């Protein structure tokens, strides 16, 4: 049995649990990206990557038990569900929280804008490399990973370019520029600074607590401060265990997951090693519900949003990471970084096309929105539209000089080929500048038709026609003049 987890979690506690149960545990760095290419028997990670793992077939579907379904919280089960099936066993729910030193400051600031004043008085710092920690500031002002509508996620819609995300990133880079926040700092430096008491504040999850418990300094956790009157919305992660599909000990690992580590003594042991935060199991969560830190983490989780499970998340993280790094060092502006991330997000673009769009955004930022719109249109064209269509519909239905036939033709053309709507509308407009009956039959042997407003006009026309060709009864029933 081989287990791979992140280095900041409770590796020793899980090792003791496995020794009680042979079991081998490791915590390699960058494990979340080498796991898909290598394929460990079971891997502990957040639920975001497990969707892509299941799509690629790297994770085997787990057969559950109804009592085991009732043992844990339901939203954990729904969050770990991809395409209606369960792939991983929920273990813990982690949400970011603000940790402050009580001696440094009595009360945490309610707003992010007050933090520069506190820092200037001191003369807060945290991890910047990972997009995970940066994202709450971006998403506080309305930014979002994907549009969650009616219970499904819209891949075609991306919210990293919203004005709120721009405002949050500009605020962060302004904190960087004023020497309040180092752009090169990472998680280890943040932990070292907070353990030494150099920084008055930090953003971190439950797992850091044990580390700060080794610092013997009082620490208080709470909800992250609001941004421009809007509460921060950190992504809510679910740490769960996924089973390798190629593991020769699949049933052994499944029994280990069900009967040993997802039990009270295993959870309490790993929590003693490193605080896992909100555990999905009901009994141990109620036991730890009295702890105010878990209550603050739960409040942050409710204020935040549950991290999605679409396989299109990983590259999204990558894109955001690059943008944040591009925002961090001052190599480029916030708007440029968000545009580059947006270009990086959509998958159907070819690598050469993506590089061309990168250069296009590099050499001309004045038309960035046009470039983004054209790239999105190309992406949907190569993907394996109603916005402008309704506007064109409404404009044409109001056309005053256009007769009914031409309006119907233009409407049919719009409904038929929407991608050429913008041209067609203009053509209709052009026509707007320029414009500013019963068929009767005659039964020399042969039949003819002519369009006339009434019977006598058609009779006159038919009599003329007969006159030119060397030739009377009329039937309303068949609308027909017969000549003999």
């Amino acid at each position, epitope marked *: 049995l081989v287990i791979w987890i992140n280095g900041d979690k409770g590796y020793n506690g899980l090792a003791e649990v496995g020794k009680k149960f042979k079991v081998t545990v490791e915590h390699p760095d960058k494990l979340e990206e080498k796991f898909p290419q290598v394929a460990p028997d079971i891997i502990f990670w957040a639920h975001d990557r497990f969707g892509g793992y299941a799509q690629s077939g790297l994770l085997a579907e787990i057969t559950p038990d109804k009592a085991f379904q009732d043992k844990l919280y339901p939203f954990t089960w729904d969050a770990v569900r991809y395409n209606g099936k369960l792939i991983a066993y929920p273990i813990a729910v982690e949400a970011l929280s603000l940790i402050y030193n009580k001696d440094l400051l009595p009360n945490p600031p309610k707003t992010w804008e007050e933090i520069p004043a506190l820092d200037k008085e001191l003369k807060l710092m945290f991890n910047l490399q990972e997009p995970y920690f940066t994202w709450p500031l971006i998403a506080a002002d309305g930014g979002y990973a994907f549009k969650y509508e009616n219970g499904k996620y819209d891949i075609k819609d991306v919210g990293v370019d919203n004005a709120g995300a721009k405002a949050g990133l500009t605020f962060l880079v302004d904190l960087i520029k004023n020497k309040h926040m180092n752009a090169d700092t990472d998680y280890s430096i943040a932990e070292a600074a907070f353990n030494k008491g150099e920084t008055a504040m930090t953003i971190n999850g439950p797992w850091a607590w044990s580390n700060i418990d080794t610092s013997k300094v009082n620490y208080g956790v709470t909800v992250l401060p609001t941004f421009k009157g809007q509460p921060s919305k950190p992504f809510v992660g679910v740490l769960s265990a996924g089973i390798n599909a190629a593991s020769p000990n699949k049933e052994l690992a499944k029994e280990f997951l069900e009967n040993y580590l997802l039990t009270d003594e295993g959870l309490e042991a790993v929590n003693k090693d490193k605080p896992l935060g909100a555990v999905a199991l009901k009994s141990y969560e109620e036991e730890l519900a009295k702890d105010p830190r878990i209550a603050a983490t739960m409040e942050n989780a409710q204020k935040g949003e549950i991290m999605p499970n679409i396989p299109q998340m990983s590259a999204f993280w990558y894109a955001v990471r690059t943008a944040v790094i591009n925002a961090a060092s001052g190599r480029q502006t916030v708007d440029q970084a968000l545009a580059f991330a947006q270009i990086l997000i959509m998958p159907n673009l070819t690598e050469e096309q993506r590089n061309g769009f990168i250069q296009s955004l590099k050499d001309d930022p004045s038309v960035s929105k046009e470039i983004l719109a054209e790239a999105k249109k190309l992406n949907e*064209h190569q993907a394996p539209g109603s916005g402008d269509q309704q506007s064109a519909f409404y404009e044409i239905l109001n056309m005053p000089n256009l007769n009914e036939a031409q309006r*119907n*033709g233009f409407i049919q*053309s719009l409904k*038929d*080929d929407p991608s*050429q709507s913008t041209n067609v509308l203009g053509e209709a407009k*052009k026509l707007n500048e320029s414009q500013a009956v019963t068929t009767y039959k005659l039964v020399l042997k042969g039949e003819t038709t002519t369009k006339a407003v009434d019977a006598e006009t058609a009779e006159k026309a038919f009599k003329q026609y007969a006159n030119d060709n060397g030739v009377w009864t009329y039937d309303d029933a068949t609308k027909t003049f017969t000549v003999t």
Partner: antibody
Amino acid sequence: DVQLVESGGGLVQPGKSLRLSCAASGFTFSNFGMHWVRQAPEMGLEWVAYISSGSTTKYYGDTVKGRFTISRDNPKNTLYLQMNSLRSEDTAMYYCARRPLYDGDYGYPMDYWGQGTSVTVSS
Amino acid sequence: NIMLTQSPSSLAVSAGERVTMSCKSTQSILYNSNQKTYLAWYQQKPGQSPKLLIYWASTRASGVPDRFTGSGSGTDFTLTINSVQPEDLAVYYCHQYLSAWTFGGGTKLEIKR
């Protein structure tokens, strides 16, 4: 054998609209791209419109872009061309043609042509 | 879009000898990946739809006789009939299908007797 039949031609006043339909038989229509090509005595053969097999890719002539719309109905094996804002230079005969599969690999151009319908515009 | 111009236009000949009708291209239509020139010769009898005669400027379409032959390269191409027959009177178009689709002006083959 592969057969293509056009319909919908006739006489329409300038500025009005018209619809041309091309019915295909004898082959899997849902797998081939289609072309609309018009010919006049004083203009000759000139490509007008093209639609791919899955209707994802469509191209239009320079002089007809913005007025003509090309589409297809795979389940009933039909190809539609909607013509709008007609001018006096559009009087011609229209054919629907079938573009072979993977012409970037075998180089086979438009091979089967329909009989064509005569569309004339005048006041 | 690439414009094609056919030089001979109307041409009269008796039955039995060769005829050479040439057409010039504004741009080179040589595809680089497979080194194949993309140009076709179409024959249209009066009151008939165009019928494919030659594709890739050298290859003969299935069912055509061996009298028809295509040659040329660069921007100049020729179609040659070795023995013109009494039912060979038609209009011959050279058409490129590399960039968009365009047709030539059309040369009319007239028959002398």
